[PDB]
């Protein structure tokens, strides 16, 4: 076995699994999902005695997901689900892609109202869509502003927002938000006169966030360790999982 040496021992046989996903979304201004998909990878860090054979079980085929495709570390034996002797230390067990039944962590709802030739009233609502007892964090909503913008007012009850002139966007940062909640920002965008004819091609509003679960739906069901020679067994292994779901491209046309 060219990725794992022979004399490995730990008194604490311990393992950690990391389900890392990024959810990509393109949504129309009234809420149709135009494109969506998750790219995931599972990373394992193991400190296990000897040459353990491991079995990774997840909810592939009431919580149950669809992998469109996926690829495996050299140690996974192909033929009917997932088996290996892992390398010692940290390594990437698998990489996968999902499109069906994704949990979109946020809905963005834009409202833009032209007020004469002078102002845009913009309202943006964000809805968290996941368990009440879970918190997203590092939320960033980014609202683009046109080239003739002379100044901007904003009010937001949650988080903090700044207009960044050099970037033609209002950036709204929220430290944390629980599931099943709603929040808004209001902005007035003040405009310089501009050449009347050509009209504003509105870029989409983008978000970033991190959520403590897998937008694809993936749940780790078990990580089985059988080591047939050494006097530790599966119950002796201490096991942890963590889910880190982050936005990729997450855009709502407006």
């Amino acid at each position: 076995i060219g990725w794992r040496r022979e004399g490995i021992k730990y008194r604490r046989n311990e393992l950690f699994l990391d389900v890392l996903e990024s959810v990509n979304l393109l949504m129309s201004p009234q809420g149709q999902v135009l494109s969506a998909h998750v790219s995931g990878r599972v990373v394992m860090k193991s400190y296990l005695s000897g040459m353990p054979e491991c079995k990774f079980g997840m909810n592939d085929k009431k919580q149950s997901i669809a992998i469109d495709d996926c690829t495996f570390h050299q140690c996974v034996r192909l033929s009917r689900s997932i088996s290996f002797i892992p390398p010692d230390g940290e390594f990437e067990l698998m990489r996968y892609r999902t499109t069906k039944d994704i949990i979109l962590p946020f809905r963005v709802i834009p409202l833009v109202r032209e007020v004469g030739r002078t102002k845009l009233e913009v309202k943006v609502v964000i809805k968290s869509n996941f368990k009440p007892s879970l918190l997203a964090q590092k939320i960033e909503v980014r609202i683009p502003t046109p080239l003739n913008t002379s100044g901007v007012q904003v009010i937001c009850m949650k988080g903090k927002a700044k207009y960044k002139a050099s970037e033609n966007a209002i950036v709204w940062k929220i430290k944390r938000m629980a599931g099943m909640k709603e929040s808004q920002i209001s902005a007035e965008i003040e405009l310089l006169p501009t050449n009347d004819k050509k009209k504003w091609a509105r870029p989409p509003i983008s978000m970033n966030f991190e959520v403590p679960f897998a937008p694809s739906g993936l749940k780790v069901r078990y990580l089985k360790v059988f080591e047939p020679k050494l006097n530790y067994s599966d119950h002796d292994v201490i096991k942890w999982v963590r889910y880190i779901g982050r936005s990729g491209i997450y855009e709502t046309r407006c």
């Binding site: 950690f16 699994l17 964090q137 403590p212 780790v220 078990y222 990580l223 096991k239 942890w240 999982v241 963590r242 880190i244």
Partner: peptide
């Protein structure tokens, strides 16, 4: 903060 990271796995 975060915290996270890890949860116990049965």
């Amino acid at each position: 903060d975060e915290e996270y990271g890890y949860e116990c796995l049965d």
